[PDB]
Amino acid sequence: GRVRTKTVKRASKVLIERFYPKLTLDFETNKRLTSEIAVIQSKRLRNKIAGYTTHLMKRIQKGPVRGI
Amino acid sequence: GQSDKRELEGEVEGTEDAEAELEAEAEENDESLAELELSKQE
Amino acid sequence: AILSKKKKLVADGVFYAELNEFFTRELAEQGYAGVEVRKTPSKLEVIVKASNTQGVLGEQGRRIHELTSLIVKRFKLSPEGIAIYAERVEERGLSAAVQAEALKAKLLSGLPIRRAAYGVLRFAMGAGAKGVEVVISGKLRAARAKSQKYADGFMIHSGQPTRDFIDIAIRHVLMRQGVLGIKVKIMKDPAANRFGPRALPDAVKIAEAKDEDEVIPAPTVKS
Amino acid sequence: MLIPKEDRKKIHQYLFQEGVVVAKKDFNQPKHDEIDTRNLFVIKALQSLTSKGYVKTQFSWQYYYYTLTDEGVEFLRTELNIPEGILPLTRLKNAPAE
Amino acid sequence: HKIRITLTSTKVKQLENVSANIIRNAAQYNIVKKGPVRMPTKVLKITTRKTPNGEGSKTWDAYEMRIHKRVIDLQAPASTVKRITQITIEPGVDVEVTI
RNA sequence: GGCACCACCAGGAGUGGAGCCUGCGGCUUAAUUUGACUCAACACGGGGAAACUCACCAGGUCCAGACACAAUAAGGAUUGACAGAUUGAGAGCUCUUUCUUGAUUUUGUGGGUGGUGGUGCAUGGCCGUUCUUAGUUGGUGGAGUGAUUUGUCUGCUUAAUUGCGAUAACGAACGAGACCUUAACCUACUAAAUAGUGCUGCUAGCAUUUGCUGGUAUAGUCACUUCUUAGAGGGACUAUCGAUUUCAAGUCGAUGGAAGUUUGAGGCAAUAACAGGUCUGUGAUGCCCUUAGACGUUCUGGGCCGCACGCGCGCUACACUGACGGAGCCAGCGAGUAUAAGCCUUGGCCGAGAGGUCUGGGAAAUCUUGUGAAACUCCGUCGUGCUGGGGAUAGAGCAUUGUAAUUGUUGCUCUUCAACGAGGAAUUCCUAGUAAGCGCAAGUCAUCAGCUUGCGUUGAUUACGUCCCUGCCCUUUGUACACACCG
Numbered sequence A: 001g002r003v004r005t006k007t008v009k010r011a012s013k014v015l016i017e018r019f020y021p022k023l024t025l026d027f028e029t030n031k032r033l034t035s036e037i038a039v040i041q042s043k044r045l046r047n048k049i050a051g052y053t054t055h056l057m058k059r060i061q062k063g064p065v066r067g068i
Numbered sequence B: 001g002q003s004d005k006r007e008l009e010g011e012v013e014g015t016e017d018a019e020a021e022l023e024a025e026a027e028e029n030d031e032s033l034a035e036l037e038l039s040k041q042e
Numbered sequence C: 001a002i003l004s005k006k007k008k009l010v011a012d013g014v015f016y017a018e019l020n021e022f023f024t025r026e027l028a029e030q031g032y033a034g035v036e037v038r039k040t041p042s043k044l045e046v047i048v049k050a051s052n053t054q055g056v057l058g059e060q061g062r063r064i065h066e067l068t069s070l071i072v073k074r075f076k077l078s079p080e081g082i083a084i085y086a087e088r089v090e091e092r093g094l095s096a097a098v099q100a101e102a103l104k105a106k107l108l109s110g111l112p113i114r115r116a117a118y119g120v121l122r123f124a125m126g127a128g129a130k131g132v133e134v135v136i137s138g139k140l141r142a143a144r145a146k147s148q149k150y151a152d153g154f155m156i157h158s159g160q161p162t163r164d165f166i167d168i169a170i171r172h173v174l175m176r177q178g179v180l181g182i183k184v185k186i187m188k189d190p191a192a193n194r195f196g197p198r199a200l201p202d203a204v205k206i207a208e209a210k211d212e213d214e215v216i217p218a219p220t221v222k223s
Numbered sequence D: 001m002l003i004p005k006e007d008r009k010k011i012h013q014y015l016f017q018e019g020v021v022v023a024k025k026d027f028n029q030p031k032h033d034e035i036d037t038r039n040l041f042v043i044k045a046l047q048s049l050t051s052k053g054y055v056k057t058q059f060s061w062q063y064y065y066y067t068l069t070d071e072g073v074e075f076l077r078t079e080l081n082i083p084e085g086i087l088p089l090t091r092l093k094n095a096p097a098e
Numbered sequence E: 001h002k003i004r005i006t007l008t009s010t011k012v013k014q015l016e017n018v019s020a021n022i023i024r025n026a027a028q029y030n031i032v033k034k035g036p037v038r039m040p041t042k043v044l045k046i047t048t049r050k051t052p053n054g055e056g057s058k059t060w061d062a063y064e065m066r067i068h069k070r071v072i073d074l075q076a077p078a079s080t081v082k083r084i085t086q087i088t089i090e091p092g093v094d095v096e097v098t099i
Numbered sequence F: 001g002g003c004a005c006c007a008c009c010a011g012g013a014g015u016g017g018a019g020c021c022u023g024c025g026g027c028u029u030a031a032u033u034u035g036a037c038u039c040a041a042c043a044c045g046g047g048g049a050a051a052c053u054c055a056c057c058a059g060g061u062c063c064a065g066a067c068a069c070a071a072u073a074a075g076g077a078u079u080g081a082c083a084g085a086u087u088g089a090g091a092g093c094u095c096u097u098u099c100u101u102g103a104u105u106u107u108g109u110g111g112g113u114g115g116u117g118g119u120g121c122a123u124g125g126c127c128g129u130u131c132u133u134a135g136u137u138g139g140u141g142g143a144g145u146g147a148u149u150u151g152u153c154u155g156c157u158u159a160a161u162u163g164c165g166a167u168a169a170c171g172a173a174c175g176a177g178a179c180c181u182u183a184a185c186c187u188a189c190u191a192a193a194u195a196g197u198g199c200u201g202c203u204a205g206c207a208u209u210u211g212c213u214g215g216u217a218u219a220g221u222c223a224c225u226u227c228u229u230a231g232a233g234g235g236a237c238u239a240u241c242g243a244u245u246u247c248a249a250g251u252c253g254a255u256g257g258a259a260g261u262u263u264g265a266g267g268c269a270a271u272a273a274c275a276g277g278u279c280u281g282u283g284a285u286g287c288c289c290u291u292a293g294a295c296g297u298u299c300u301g302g303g304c305c306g307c308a309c310g311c312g313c314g315c316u317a318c319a320c321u322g323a324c325g326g327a328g329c330c331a332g333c334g335a336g337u338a339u340a341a342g343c344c345u346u347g348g349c350c351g352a353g354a355g356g357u358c359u360g361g362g363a364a365a366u367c368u369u370g371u372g373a374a375a376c377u378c379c380g381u382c383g384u385g386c387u388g389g390g391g392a393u394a395g396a397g398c399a400u401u402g403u404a405a406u407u408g409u410u411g412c413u414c415u416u417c418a419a420c421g422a423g424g425a426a427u428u429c430c431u432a433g434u435a436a437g438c439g440c441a442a443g444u445c446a447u448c449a450g451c452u453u454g455c456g457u458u459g460a461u462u463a464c465g466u467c468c469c470u471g472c473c474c475u476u477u478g479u480a481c482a483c484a485c486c487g
């Protein structure tokens, strides 16, 4: 399965509560953005966090999401 | 220390050894050819 | 003689393994921590790290002099080709080798485990370790053998980071009733790591919001 | 042990004058490389000295590390009949290094 | 001369620092260089049984020893090349110079 | 309730049936050393034992019994010994025999020491297993007098206590995941005479059209990094779009993509636990036993292989989707030496072979080596026949290793050519470069691989589901158990 974990779900939604205007709907742009926002030790996790933040951002434009 | 004592004591007694030893050792840190005689047989 | 690249580097490792064990049995009473083999031109610098550098370089540095001669004579080294130095352990509380022998030296003195065990739990934390866990296994005035774990602070167990932030020391303790086996697992604080990673892989440090400034409609400040 | 008197001597002017001796644990080796006698003689000769507190014995990786105690130097002073003519070599006080 | 320097070690960062530092020192000094040449790394593999005894499921350890070898050719007199070796001494990497 | 090819379904390959290899039991034995007995004992102790190994058996040596004493002792305490006898032995082991050495040493006391001797039911360490299943824990808050409990859950989802969600809980930690190694991508960087290429010198063969195949080239003092190597990075996050879902976690399809099963595979791996196995790995160990006619150690010879029998891991096969006979001819993982005690070994020459010999290269991306491997493919012979399938058992002969091959170490030649005609009840492993074949390298190794650890070549059928069997996990429940049902 492709179930994201808690270290990525809570870390992804904290990005939204603090840096929503600078965020976007593009994974490539978000992945580059998160390299200067969070200190992530590994590249795969940076892409994983940015890939879930983009999914949440894409979902907020359809209405308010819970926990952010 | 399976007794009700010595884990109570063992705990408080364990800490006075180390706490005394970091400081004691931190004090330790503050002051930061014999065959010649047989050749004389010549 | 003529030795291959594969067979020389393994031999260099074997030389390290045998030399280090020589110091562990001989310098057990002086809190021997580890040995560093620094190759250099025309000399072979070896740095031994021990809690007590008085037991080694004692009585006019006789032991270190009488100890460097035993290595030239066993490895066929030129008398000038090796130089041995004795160095103090920087953080005695964070070195599990010193802590296990010291614990062994306390258990061997008849001291109770809790005063002795909590002496390494608090000494490790007092030095600033992120976590520490001690297992003592063996027989004590009873025919049946037992083991006890003493944890403290934060300890990680799985994956590569255990290879980076944890050092381990196993010591057999020779008692009149049997053998006591001690394992002293000390996790150093990754923040203090100075060459490899300085944090755990899943530690995410999100920056703070730099916003909430006041924007005025549209001037330009020249110079 | 049956050691010839002369061969026992050579073991003593090597364990004195470089007062440490290393001997591999092989009993049938003809010559311990640095003391021209049987290798077995070196192990057993110093086993007597370590039996009466004249040498420390350490064993690691099938090798013997014999070192002469300060208490043993005075005894060889009287058996080799040497005078207090200097230090062996490991007591010459070359001093450590910093 | 044409002098070849052969570099071997178990860990690559210190070997590569020495490799880059010598080329760097071979750069401000106007010395023509060839390298570094990366030899195929050698994986020294030893596969033992886990059990000291012979009981349990037959489980095996697989130990490894990476050996990396690089050779750099420098075209300079032997006196010049040798003093670079002592400037760039690193404990892990051993150096042999052959003409 | 849930999960799982060490469970099943749909299937594949099989095993169990034969011969033989090997391990175990049994029987035998002078000894046939021993540990292990469901999974988690039985090609396992890296255990492929001629000697050694070795612990077993029949015999024979040595002290390598330190050290404090006491005795003896220079008018010599004691050690080696030619020759004959003795012995398996050119062991002065011992006996006749007198030489030699010289306080090292001989006898008693204590004390040692060494044990593949006993005890894994005294232990350390290590390892296996529950289990790599998904489980474990505290802070604050709520409940209870308390031990405790909630958090840790009806439901959905995932490989997962992993997430959505519900919520007297809130917010967290270990484990899982992250992490690390490896395999697959990079005409984008960095270079490479130990990698490769185009041009160019010089050069060969064939048709002459200026072309097609080569050799040579460590001075052509060339160019380049696609293939090759490896360091710094990039790249995938299920990306985009459709469906379903509490519109949540997610799942399934497409498109793009090197990669969309956690991208494939592994490494590490929690809290405790088992009288699980190892004192036969250790100069790791406590205690017990032995310690000079040894249970120490060593030498010679035998045994661990012994054969009415039962069982397990396997290898060959029962043929034609095949055997031979020629011909074609492609990998990947690796290893490799000196005054040794002898490494990988091309090339030439002998030899039917096995193998021998003479030279040379390589401590290695350089040489062995493109390891020109085998299945495989082509052309023939064979023609359903225990037949040219199968190659046991055995006779005779030739070489190799080794001090030593007898109870054939192994290889080669001719002859002999057995069961076996696809295997009962049962039962094992397995979902993609996977299964199955097919070989090769490394380990053991003086010699021997039907064994393991890996690697590549050819390359599928069938699910992609379930709790019917089997095992495990969770909840509820009962308990007179808590040394916890081996109660």
Ligand SMILES: [Mg+2]
Pocket: C158
């Ligand atoms: Mg973790």
Ligand SMILES: [Mg+2]
Pocket: C158, C159
């Ligand atoms: Mg993990």
Ligand SMILES: [Mg+2]
Pocket: C168, C169, C170
């Ligand atoms: Mg260790």
Ligand SMILES: [Mg+2]
Pocket: F002
């Ligand atoms: Mg479940």
Ligand SMILES: [Mg+2]
Pocket: F002
């Ligand atoms: Mg469920």
Ligand SMILES: [Mg+2]
Pocket: none
């Ligand atoms: Mg379900």
Ligand SMILES: [Mg+2]
Pocket: F006
């Ligand atoms: Mg199981």
Ligand SMILES: [Mg+2]
Pocket: none
């Ligand atoms: Mg089954």
Ligand SMILES: [Mg+2]
Pocket: none
């Ligand atoms: Mg079936």
Ligand SMILES: [Mg+2]
Pocket: none
């Ligand atoms: Mg078969």
Ligand SMILES: [Mg+2]
Pocket: none
């Ligand atoms: Mg039997």
Ligand SMILES: [Mg+2]
Pocket: F032
């Ligand atoms: Mg038997």
Ligand SMILES: [Mg+2]
Pocket: none
């Ligand atoms: Mg024998």
Ligand SMILES: [Mg+2]
Pocket: none
């Ligand atoms: Mg024995």
Ligand SMILES: [Mg+2]
Pocket: F120, F276
């Ligand atoms: Mg047990």
Ligand SMILES: [Mg+2]
Pocket: none
């Ligand atoms: Mg499993």
